């Protein structure tokens, strides 16, 4: 796959932000970009699995999951979910599971880290919220642009040479 970042930058410099999150890189595509859905919850994945349950294309679901690292909010199973969806790709502020399993499939994934253990889901959370992580602000609705270079956030969808 190609970079896609770098051109852009220079092509809308005005018009897209840097979203600086120290995230890592788990998936087969390295590159994906979308309409942002938002989830914010907090060791309970259960938002996690109902968005992900509903049409995805041409979407990136970003989750705040307050940056914790103790339990995975997502697994392979729910990145199954995710591409059967039509998902472009997910963003989790906190951590997943499953990672090899993750390095073969269809799906751009970032991440802070990786945690083991699953978490009890009791329906708690919050969909297409606006998120703040890293004191950087997240809004459902934005467009946003992934690769190995970094993510980039626009308020208009841009176009992507490809």
Known sequence: MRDITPDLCDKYESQVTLLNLPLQNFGQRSAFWGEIVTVRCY?????????????????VLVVDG?????????????????????????????????????SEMDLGIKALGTSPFKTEKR???????????????????????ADWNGILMSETALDVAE
Do not use: F
């Open 66 to 102: 307050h940056g914790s690292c103790h339990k995975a909010l997502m697994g392979d199973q729910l990145a199954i979910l995710a591409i059967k969806n039509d998902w472009e790709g997910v963003i989790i502020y906190g951590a997943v599971r499953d990672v090899v399993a993750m």
């Open 123 to 145: 329906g708690a959370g919050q969909v297409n919220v606006t998120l703040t992580m890293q004191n950087q602000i997240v809004e459902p609705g934005d467009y946003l642009y």
């Open 43 to 59: 060791h309970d994945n259960s938002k996690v699995r109902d968005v992900l349950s509903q049409n995805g294309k041409g979407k």
